[PDB]
Amino acid sequence: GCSAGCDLALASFYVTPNQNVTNMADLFGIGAANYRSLAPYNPNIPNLDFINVGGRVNVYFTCGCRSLPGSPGATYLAGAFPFQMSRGQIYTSVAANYNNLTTAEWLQATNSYPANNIPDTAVINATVNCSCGDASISPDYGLFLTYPLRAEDTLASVAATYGLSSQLDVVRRYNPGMESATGSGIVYIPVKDPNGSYLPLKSPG
Numbered sequence: 001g002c003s004a005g006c007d008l009a010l011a012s013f014y015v016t017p018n019q020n021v022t023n024m025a026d027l028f029g030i031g032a033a034n035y036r037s038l039a040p041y042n043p044n045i046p047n048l049d050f051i052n053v054g055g056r057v058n059v060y061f062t063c064g065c066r067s068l069p070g071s072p073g074a075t076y077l078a079g080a081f082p083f084q085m086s087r088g089q090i091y092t093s094v095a096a097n098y099n100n101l102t103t104a105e106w107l108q109a110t111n112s113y114p115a116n117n118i119p120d121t122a123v124i125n126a127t128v129n130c131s132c133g134d135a136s137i138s139p140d141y142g143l144f145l146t147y148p149l150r151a152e153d154t155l156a157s158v159a160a161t162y163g164l165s166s167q168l169d170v171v172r173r174y175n176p177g178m179e180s181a182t183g184s185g186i187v188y189i190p191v192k193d194p195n196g197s198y199l200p201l202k203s204p205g
């Protein structure tokens with residue numbers, strides 16, 4: 001499980017036709033009015049009004065350690081984005097906006113209401129998995145990108161895309177159960193902060 005979280009994680013949001021950055025900001029609790037706060041995390045997107053289909057946008061969030069409701073002692077690391085309910089909304093339609101960053105089944109598992117009886121006045125959480133690293137794996141990496149595999153993607157090919165081929169062994173240790181996965185599932189990739197650091201971890205006591 002997890003003991004505590006960290007204050008920053010990133011998600012790789014694949015760009016589909018007619019997506020826009022204010023909508024991505026809204027989905028991650030940033031608020032449309034503050035979408036420009038995404039610029040330092042996306043140096044390859046100099047104009048946030050133009051995002052190309054098939055591109056990716058990095059979106060930031062806080063990574064909290066949460067208990068899974070109704071499960072025995074299970075905890076997990078994720079960002080939680082409150083979503084105000086109204087009549088007509090279902091876990092499937094909430095999850096649809098995040099593409100492969102979450103799933104209806106995972107929203108059901110992380111929220112405390114049964115799918116078939118969510119009160120119309122309640123607030124549910126859209127939850128996106130993250131990692132904060134592990135000092136016992138490496139003190140070097142304290143910032144991770146949540147990357148949904150798609151198409152032919154493998155952990156090796158993704159890690160190579162982010163310059164991490166020579167550390168692939170270490171990358172595999174952050175992604176247990178996904179060393180053999182291809183084209184589907186979420187992997188966590190160490191990435192550099194806007195100031196160019198991997199944000200090394202403090203020595204635990």
Ligand SMILES: CC(=O)N[C@@H]1[C@@H](O)[C@H](O[C@@H]2O[C@H](CO)[C@@H](O[C@@H]3O[C@H](CO)[C@@H](O[C@@H]4O[C@H](CO)[C@@H](O[C@@H]5O[C@H](CO)[C@@H](O[C@@H]6O[C@H](CO)[C@@H](O)[C@H](O)[C@H]6NC(C)=O)[C@H](O)[C@H]5NC(C)=O)[C@H](O)[C@H]4NC(C)=O)[C@H](O)[C@H]3NC(C)=O)[C@H](O)[C@H]2NC(C)=O)[C@@H](CO)O[C@H]1O
Nearest residue numbers: 085086087088089090091092093104115116117118119120
């Ligand atoms: C086919 C294949 O293999 N794959 C694909 C396939 O997945 C796609 O099909 C779609 O799949 C999804 C996932 O399985 C289906 O999603 C499910 O859909 C059902 C039906 O809509 C959902 O069930 C409804 O859930 C809502 C929300 O909980 C219920 O609404 C609530 O109802 C209660 C009671 O009526 C309301 O409470 C009342 O409120 C009043 C007002 O204050 C109060 O006075 C009363 O006291 C109070 N009553 C009580 C008892 O408390 C409550 O307000 C309301 N909530 C809201 C927000 O409105 C609703 O009743 C449920 N309906 C039924 C029936 O159970 C279910 O939650 C949902 N699951 C998930 C996980 O989201 C989807 O239906 C399906 N689509 C189709 C078309 O079949 C297909 C197609 O896309 O693609 C394939 O590829």
Ligand SMILES: *[C@@H]1O[C@H](CO[C@@H]2O[C@@H](C)[C@@H](O)[C@@H](O)[C@@H]2O)[C@@H](O[C@@H]2O[C@H](CO)[C@@H](O[C@@H]3O[C@H](CO)[C@@H](O)[C@H](O)[C@@H]3O)[C@H](O)[C@H]2NC(C)=O)[C@H](O[C@@H]2O[C@@H](C)[C@@H](O)[C@@H](O)[C@@H]2O)[C@H]1NC(C)=O
Nearest residue numbers: 015016017018019020021022023024026027096097098099
């Ligand atoms: C930024 O994108 C938002 C999301 O767009 C949706 O997701 C993307 C990834 C892509 O799949 C698009 O094809 C989707 O629409 C835009 O908001 C969406 O706006 C549409 C309406 O254009 C709305 O769809 C439906 O509209 C019918 C109309 O009959 C209505 O009955 C339905 O209930 C439903 O509203 C979506 O709900 C809406 N999505 C969200 C998450 O809000 C957004 O469009 C701009 O804002 C909306 C509210 C309208 O004013 C649009 O006309 C307006 O252009 C995009 N923002 C900008 C600035 O372009």
Ligand SMILES: *[C@@H]1O[C@H](CO)[C@@H](O[C@@H]2O[C@H](CO)[C@@H](O)[C@H](O)[C@H]2NC(C)=O)[C@H](O)[C@H]1NC(C)=O
Nearest residue numbers: 068074075076077101102103106129177185186
């Ligand atoms: C988010 O992360 C949690 C925790 O890793 C995932 O839940 C685990 O899924 C595996 C299946 O690969 C199970 O063996 C574990 O028992 C699950 N743990 C818990 C606490 O439920 C979850 O699947 C991830 N969500 C998404 C959308 O990838």
Ligand SMILES: *[C@@H]1O[C@H](CO)[C@@H](O[C@@H]2O[C@H](CO)[C@@H](O)[C@H](O)[C@H]2NC(C)=O)[C@H](O)[C@H]1NC(C)=O
Nearest residue numbers: 066069080082110111112113122123124125126
């Ligand atoms: C969404 O996640 C939040 C945590 O960020 C949950 O917040 C809890 O809400 C209940 C309301 O009865 C409070 O009693 C708890 O103290 C809250 N926990 C906190 C603030 O850590 C909330 O329950 C989640 N929503 C759903 C639908 O599961």
